[PDB]
Amino acid sequence: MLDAFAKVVAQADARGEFLTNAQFDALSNLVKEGNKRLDAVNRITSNASTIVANAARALFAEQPQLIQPGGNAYTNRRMAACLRDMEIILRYVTYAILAGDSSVLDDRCLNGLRETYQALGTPGSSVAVAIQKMKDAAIAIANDPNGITPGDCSALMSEIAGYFDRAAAAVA
Amino acid sequence: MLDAFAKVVAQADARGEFLTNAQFDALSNLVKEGNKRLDAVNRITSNASTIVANAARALFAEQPQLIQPGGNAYTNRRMAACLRDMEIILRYVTYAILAGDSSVLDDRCLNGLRETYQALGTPGSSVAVAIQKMKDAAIAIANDPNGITPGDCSALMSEIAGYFDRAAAAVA
Amino acid sequence: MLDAFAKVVAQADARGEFLTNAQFDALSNLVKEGNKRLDAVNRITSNASTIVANAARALFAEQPQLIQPGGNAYTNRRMAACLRDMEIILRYVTYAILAGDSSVLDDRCLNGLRETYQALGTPGSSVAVAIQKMKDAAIAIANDPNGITPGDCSALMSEIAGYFDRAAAAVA
Amino acid sequence: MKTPITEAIAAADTQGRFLSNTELQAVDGRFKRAVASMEAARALTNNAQSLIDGAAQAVYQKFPYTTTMQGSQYASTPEGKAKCARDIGYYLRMVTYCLVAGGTGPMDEYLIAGLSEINSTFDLSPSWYIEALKYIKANHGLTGQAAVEANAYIDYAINALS
Amino acid sequence: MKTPITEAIAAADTQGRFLSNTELQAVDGRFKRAVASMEAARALTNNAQSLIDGAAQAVYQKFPYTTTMQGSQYASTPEGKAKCARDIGYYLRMVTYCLVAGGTGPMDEYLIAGLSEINSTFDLSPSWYIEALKYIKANHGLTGQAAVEANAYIDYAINALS
Amino acid sequence: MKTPITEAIAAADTQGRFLSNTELQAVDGRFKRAVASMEAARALTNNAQSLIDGAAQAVYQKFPYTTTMQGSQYASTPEGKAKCARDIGYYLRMVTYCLVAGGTGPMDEYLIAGLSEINSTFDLSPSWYIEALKYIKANHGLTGQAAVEANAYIDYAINALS
Ligand SMILES: *[C@@H](C)[C@H]1C(Cc2[nH]c(Cc3[nH]c(/C=C4\NC(=O)C(CC)=C4C)c(C)c3CCC(=O)O)c(CCC(=O)O)c2C)=NC(=O)[C@@H]1C
Ligand SMILES: *[C@@H](C)[C@H]1C(Cc2[nH]c(Cc3[nH]c(/C=C4\NC(=O)C(CC)=C4C)c(C)c3CCC(=O)O)c(CCC(=O)O)c2C)=NC(=O)[C@@H]1C
Ligand SMILES: *[C@@H](C)[C@H]1C(Cc2[nH]c(Cc3[nH]c(/C=C4\NC(=O)C(CC)=C4C)c(C)c3CCC(=O)O)c(CCC(=O)O)c2C)=NC(=O)[C@@H]1C
Ligand SMILES: *[C@H](C)[C@H]1C(Cc2[nH]c(Cc3[nH]c(/C=C4\NC(=O)C(CC)=C4C)c(C)c3CCC(=O)O)c(CCC(=O)O)c2C)=NC(=O)[C@@H]1C
Ligand SMILES: *[C@H](C)[C@H]1C(Cc2[nH]c(Cc3[nH]c(/C=C4\NC(=O)C(CC)=C4C)c(C)c3CCC(=O)O)c(CCC(=O)O)c2C)=NC(=O)[C@@H]1C
Ligand SMILES: *[C@H](C)[C@H]1C(Cc2[nH]c(Cc3[nH]c(/C=C4\NC(=O)C(CC)=C4C)c(C)c3CCC(=O)O)c(CCC(=O)O)c2C)=NC(=O)[C@@H]1C
Ligand SMILES: *[C@H](C)[C@H]1C(Cc2[nH]c(Cc3[nH]c(/C=C4\NC(=O)C(CC)=C4C)c(C)c3CCC(=O)O)c(CCC(=O)O)c2C)=NC(=O)[C@@H]1C
Ligand SMILES: *[C@H](C)[C@H]1C(Cc2[nH]c(Cc3[nH]c(/C=C4\NC(=O)C(CC)=C4C)c(C)c3CCC(=O)O)c(CCC(=O)O)c2C)=NC(=O)[C@@H]1C
Ligand SMILES: *[C@H](C)[C@H]1C(Cc2[nH]c(Cc3[nH]c(/C=C4\NC(=O)C(CC)=C4C)c(C)c3CCC(=O)O)c(CCC(=O)O)c2C)=NC(=O)[C@@H]1C
């Protein structure tokens, strides 16, 4: 598993190369902004149960077929399995937010996911909706201008949205 | 309704406290970004018709089911409804930008709006899409570097993002 | 396993008590001394290999019967194990130094060790000598006044001799 | 809470319109005036204990019966003197709050609404508080437009008391 | 018990490794954060009784039935009031402990382990304890990173209950 | 690759738990240490050719038989002198990589795993590299915590060869 610093380290090693100042600066500016990355993880994690539960309620409100008898999310075992997937995906996304690199989400969560859903008949389209709803909730919470020193979280928020869209693409 | 300053004051009253010398410094900083805040509001407002109509056109191109007969935005009465909502949300976003605080958007626009659409049969998902398109257009316009004294508006644009993010979160 | 803070918390919970200012103050004082604690672990750890080898060499010179044929440290397998044991004890002592609490050392290293030696035939008195050598070397290295901001680490060096003598007591 | 910004927003929302230049200009005036009003709020905050104790003393010297008349509503006891000093700092604190907000809102919401019911119910006379406010105006040592700002919110409370 | 210091040691112990620079950084981060943490912990310990009472009243108020329904599980008797207030103190004592340790370990071990089993067996609704913690979050008085520290372990309890 | 951040993540994942405050403290400690770390890495990188050329000559001076004894494994040849310099730059590069990552990871994966196998197989002796590392320590010019950071990782390499 790589964090953002290890990713640059590994790319330089494959070339046999010390780092350049462009690379030093890059990473060092990443550090300088680090408090914002901690607030984002703290904010999404601290609200995970709400993010999952509202996203799930929204999804089944939009796609009622999922919870009709016979629906892929009907019965309590399949509903809880759905909710579990929603927490797991949110979990691995926040891991990636902390790392600054997709690799932990990619290796331990996304790889093989689409084939998994294609195997159980779970509609990956609908998983994708659930992921986009969690994305909108998480970005609102993390980017919430209330209750935090004001500053520019914009590059970071584009990164977070990146990880969520990457999940959504992966499951459908 | 609170603006940024009124919020600091109401937080301090609940404590029975005068403001700190640190807090006053923080407030000087708000005052200093004054001109940029006005630019952003002027710029978004002066282009509101375009922002709304381009966003709505893009939405109906992506989601033609909305304008199929039977669709939620079919009939001129419903289409006008839809554009009115878009207009309203943007108006309330622009108010939050003037205020430097989300409370006017949250109290007069967002609170109860998910339940409203759920009850109407309006797909909040699609509404969130219209809000994201208005978002990307508004920020591009407010942060357009031509025809303005050059400088750095990144924080202000981070904050503006936050108000759109709340909006889009709130409608599913 | 507990650290100094968790031990106080575990004491307090057994009584259903919030902490007293006594304890708050004590733990706060450990935190302001924390830089020294980190210097000591890094210093001992960065010299681990030579602390162990010098101590082993010194033990065998005082106790050549251990390496005569038939002795406990004779053959390379037994020599490796003795050296290993020395590394293991030192490492857990350094865990205890970081934690500010002997519990990790007690639970995971010292508990049952005396009986293990009695079983195998290993002279625990000689292990205690080996441990007391590593202590003298480790403290002298941790408390070297060269290449470090000057100050008094006497309180800490006493704590550290604490963990070595505890360990030596437990095998002897 | 009334401030120049919430008035501007409240204007346009009542008419269901976007903000216009009409409202942006008013907010700009508020940003411009903030230099002087935050100087005033800081100076009063920094000097607050002495202003408060000095105001209380001005009240007692002007109305000495407040320190001798027997009754919970008077400062004739250790506790009535604490109550009074407390109230006077409330007043000063709300002036600083108006200055920070750029408007009467904080004082309007937290103090003036209900003011006269409370003074009547609890037999507190408005003239006591007016003298304390006069004392504060006379001794905050501010100058220039920072003075003008502080005095505007003090004379506003005095009006409310009259 | 889980703290940043035990996680660090546990990490190295599990690789049978001496501590490295990787781990000492974690401990220094904890040492620096302890300033906000220990401050939040002291504040809630000082204000404990009032947060606890305020919290129970907040709960009895959002769930009026908890005080009318007969049933040993309800605060509809003096015994159930004392059970409920005892419980709320337990939650608060657990936040304080997490602040002192710099981690969730104490709450995990002493309250979250088996939490679901108890609330089910004894018919205690999670919503009640969640309201209580919401009240504590809203009324502890903290600002800055001390507040951040208290609400993280409060929101962690809320999550556990959700 | 072992860093303070991947280790914090690894700990949560092993327990199936979202990240907690426990872990965020670890990473903050990493971020604050990173100031010293990249200074040292910058200084070592900017002056690597000197450190490398001087650490090689340092080994030759202490083990001058490595300059003359016949064999592949010796810096007896041009090719050998070039290998030795190559190896030393590898250790230096890895030291800088650890400073960038704030942990032993890069050195562990790229150099230490298999280290004993390679030195035994190609009859290279650890004390050779130990002396080169001693030289780097002695001449990086670093001061303050930048120096403590560099030497932590240089001593780690040395421990590994011992
Ligand atoms: C985008 C995420 C939003 C922000 C973020 C933002 N935060 C800060 C300051 C800041 N954040 C922390 C938080 C932590 N430090 C830790 O060690 C941990 C883990 C326990 C956390 C959660 C601190 C300590 C600070 C500095 C103190 C302060 O309150 O200022 C800033 C200021 C700049 C900076 O320090 O990087 C910003 C911009 N603000 C927004 O407007 C975005 C919505
Ligand atoms: C990000 C928004 C882009 C900026 C903004 C920017 N503006 C200024 C100066 C500036 N802006 C105004 C505008 C107004 N003053 C008012 O009262 C009103 C309401 C009718 C408006 C619209 C003024 C008067 C000024 C000062 C004079 C000038 O024209 O320069 C700056 C300069 C710094 C500052 O004052 O903060 C900047 C940087 N420029 C960019 O490049 C961003 C994309
Ligand atoms: C007895 C142990 C000797 C002392 C120790 C001593 N150190 C300091 C300051 C000090 N130590 C560090 C070390 C670290 N901080 C970290 O995060 C890590 C892990 C990566 C380490 C290894 C730092 C950063 C500092 C602060 C900066 C400085 O160099 O001063 C002091 C000063 C007092 C204090 O900071 O507590 C002392 C006294 N000095 C002696 O003379 C004893 C032999
Ligand atoms: C909810 C948004 C949607 C679901 C989800 C759903 N999933 C399953 C089974 C299921 N899900 C996974 C996912 C993962 N396992 C992992 O280890 C990881 C990463 C660590 C992930 C992301 C697996 C492996 C499985 C199969 C095993 C199991 O069910 O326990 C179900 C139930 C399948 C069934 O009962 O046939 C469901 C319902 N379904 C929807 O309709 C929502 C769109
Ligand atoms: C457009 C992108 C999407 C719509 C929107 C749509 N909305 C409605 C009705 C509607 N919208 C609101 C929202 C508000 N009323 C307020 O006062 C405020 C804040 C001031 C808000 C945000 C309300 C209350 C209503 C009901 C009132 C009405 O119908 O006029 C409709 C029409 C519903 C109908 O006539 O059946 C539509 C179509 N529809 C889409 O398809 C787009 C995704
Ligand atoms: C060296 C200074 C002295 C010895 C040491 C010696 N020990 C052993 C075997 C031995 N030591 C342990 C101790 C531990 N195992 C653990 O996992 C832990 C912490 C988790 C500890 C503290 C064990 C369990 C064993 C038996 C297992 C094994 O040998 O692999 C020997 C081997 C004796 C033999 O093989 O017959 C020796 C030589 N001997 C001396 O003379 C020194 C005083
Ligand atoms: C001081 C100039 C003179 C006093 C003062 C005095 N006041 C009271 C009671 C009192 N004061 C208030 C005022 C406020 N409550 C608010 O919330 C606000 C706005 C933030 C204000 C200005 C109230 C509501 C009350 C009654 C309730 C209470 O005790 O707090 C007393 C004691 C009253 C009594 O118990 O009888 C006194 C003595 N009296 C003098 O003689 C001084 C000149
Ligand atoms: C208060 C918000 C609401 C209650 C409270 C209530 N609790 C109980 C019994 C009860 N509570 C616990 C909780 C804990 N025990 C622990 O050890 C810990 C961690 C340290 C916790 C959080 C337990 C285990 C029990 C049952 C065992 C016991 O009696 O102590 C009652 C009475 C239940 C009964 O006797 O049947 C009540 C009333 N009920 C409400 O209505 C309040 C809203
Ligand atoms: C220099 C201090 C002394 C040497 C140097 C020397 N080394 C070799 C061969 C050699 N070195 C390595 C080391 C590494 N390979 C890696 O991938 C890494 C981490 C990235 C390291 C540290 C290896 C694996 C090898 C063997 C394979 C190869 O040739 O690359 C030689 C030549 C050995 C031979 O040809 O038999 C020499 C001379 N010897 C001295 O006398 C110097 C004092």
Numbering used by the authors:
A (entry chain B), B (entry chain D), C (entry chain F): 1 to 172
D (entry chain C), E (entry chain E), F (entry chain A): 1 to 162
Quoted from the paper:
The unique crystallization properties of the antenna protein C-phycocyanin (C-PC) from the thermophilic cyanobacterium Thermosynechococcus elongatus are reported and discussed. Since phycobilosomes are naturally organized in the cells, the in vivo C-PC assembly exhibits a tricylindrical core, from which six rods composed of three PC hexamers radiate, in order to assemble superior rigid antenna-like structures to expand light harvesting.
In contrast, the structures determined in the rhombohedral and orthorhombic space groups compose a stable dodecameric molecule. Two hexameric rings associate turned towards each other into a doughnut-shaped superstructure. The interaction surface area covers more than 61 000 Å2, with a ratio of surface-exposed versus buried area of almost 1.
